[PDB]
Amino acid sequence: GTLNQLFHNLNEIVEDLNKNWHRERRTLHDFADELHQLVKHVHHFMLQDIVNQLDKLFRDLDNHLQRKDDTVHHRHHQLNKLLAQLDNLVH
Amino acid sequence: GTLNQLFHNLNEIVEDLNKNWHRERRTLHDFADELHQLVKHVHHKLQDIVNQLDKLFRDLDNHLQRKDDTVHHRHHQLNKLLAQLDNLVHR
Ligand SMILES: [Cl-]
Ligand SMILES: [Pt+2]
C-alpha cells in the first residue's frame, strides 16, 4: 500500500533526526566545554565584567543543553511509539 | 480511524518540533549575537583569549547555518508526509 511508503519515509526521517541530534549534541557540548574552560582561564588572568558576561553565556548554553536533552528524550519516545503503531497498520 | 489517530498524533509532534526549533534558533542567535558583542568588545594570555572567543563564535556561526539547512529539509519532508497522510485518512 501507499501506507508502506509513508511508514518507510517516516522511518528514514526519524533515523536522520536521531543521527543529526547526536552530531548536534556533540558539537554543542564540545562548544560548552571550551567556553567553560575559558570562563576559568579568564578567571585566572583576573575590566572583569568580561568574566560575568562569559559566566552568563556558559549558564545560558548549559541550561539550553539540559533542557534540550529533556525535549529530545520526550520526542524520541513519542516518535517510536508512533512508528511502532504505524508498522502494525502496515504489517 | 486508527489512521486519523496517527495523523492527529504525528501532527502534534511535527508542530511541537517546529515551535521548539523557533525557540532554539532565537535562543542560539541571541547567544551568538552576545558572543559577537563580547568579541568586538574585548578587541576594544589576553590575546589568547580573543582568539579563543572568535574561534567559538565562528564554530557556532557555522553550526547555526548548517542547522538552518538541516531543519529546512526535515521540515519539508515532514510536511510532505503529513499531507500525504492527511490525503489517506479522508479517502
Ligand atoms: Cl556530554
Ligand atoms: Pt556535556
Side-chain angles (χ1 to χ4, degrees), chain A residues 2-3 5-6 9-10 13 17 20 23-24 27-28 30-32 34-35 37-38 41-42 45 49-50 53-54 56-58 60-61 64 67-68 71 75 78-79 81-83 85-86 89, chain B residues 2-3 5-7 9-10 13 16-17 20-21 23-24 27-28 30-31 34-35 37-38 41-42 45-46 49 52-53 55-57 59-60 63 66-67 70 74 77-78 81 84-85 88:
Chain A
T2 187
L3 204 58
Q5 66 178 218
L6 299 185
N9 291 5
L10 180 58
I13 287 164
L17 199 54
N20 287 322
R23 295 167 162 168
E24 175 178 12
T27 300
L28 290 182
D30 277 348
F31 181 91
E34 207 180 312
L35 169 61
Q37 84 174 236
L38 187 53
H41 293 170
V42 179
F45 188 74
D49 185 41
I50 292 149
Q53 269 156 99
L54 284 176
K56 199 266 190 168
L57 288 167
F58 173 70
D60 281 345
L61 184 57
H64 173 66
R67 293 270 298 167
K68 175 67 123 143
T71 298
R75 135 188 131 193
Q78 291 171 293
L79 288 163
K81 287 204 159 182
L82 195 142
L83 271 173
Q85 287 172 324
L86 178 48
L89 267 33
Chain B
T2 315
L3 218 54
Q5 285 161 24
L6 276 174
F7 173 79
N9 299 349
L10 182 55
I13 287 164
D16 287 345
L17 266 163
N20 286 322
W21 174 232
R23 282 179 180 164
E24 174 168 22
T27 299
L28 295 176
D30 291 355
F31 190 85
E34 293 206 77
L35 237 190
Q37 294 165 19
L38 185 79
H41 171 80
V42 172
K45 307 202 178 171
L46 220 175
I49 288 163
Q52 202 59 45
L53 292 175
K55 190 215 156 219
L56 286 165
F57 172 69
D59 288 352
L60 177 67
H63 168 65
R66 280 189 62 77
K67 185 142 200 220
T70 303
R74 139 209 126 179
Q77 291 314 283
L78 283 166
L81 226 71
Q84 295 183 62
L85 217 197
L88 235 59

Side-chain angles (χ1 to χ4, degrees), chain B residues 3 33 40 43 46 48 69 72 74 77-79 83-84:
Chain B
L3 218 54
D33 294 354
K40 283 186 180 87
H43 196 98
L46 220 175
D48 279 338
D69 290 348
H72 170 106
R74 139 209 126 179
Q77 291 314 283
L78 283 166
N79 265 111
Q84 295 183 62

Side-chain angles (χ1 to χ4, degrees), chain A residues 9-24:
Chain A
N9 291 5
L10 180 58
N11 183 56
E12 297 196 351
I13 287 164
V14 166
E15 287 180 4
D16 288 339
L17 199 54
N18 295 338
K19 165 203 303 98
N20 287 322
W21 163 237
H22 293 302
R23 295 167 162 168
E24 175 178 12

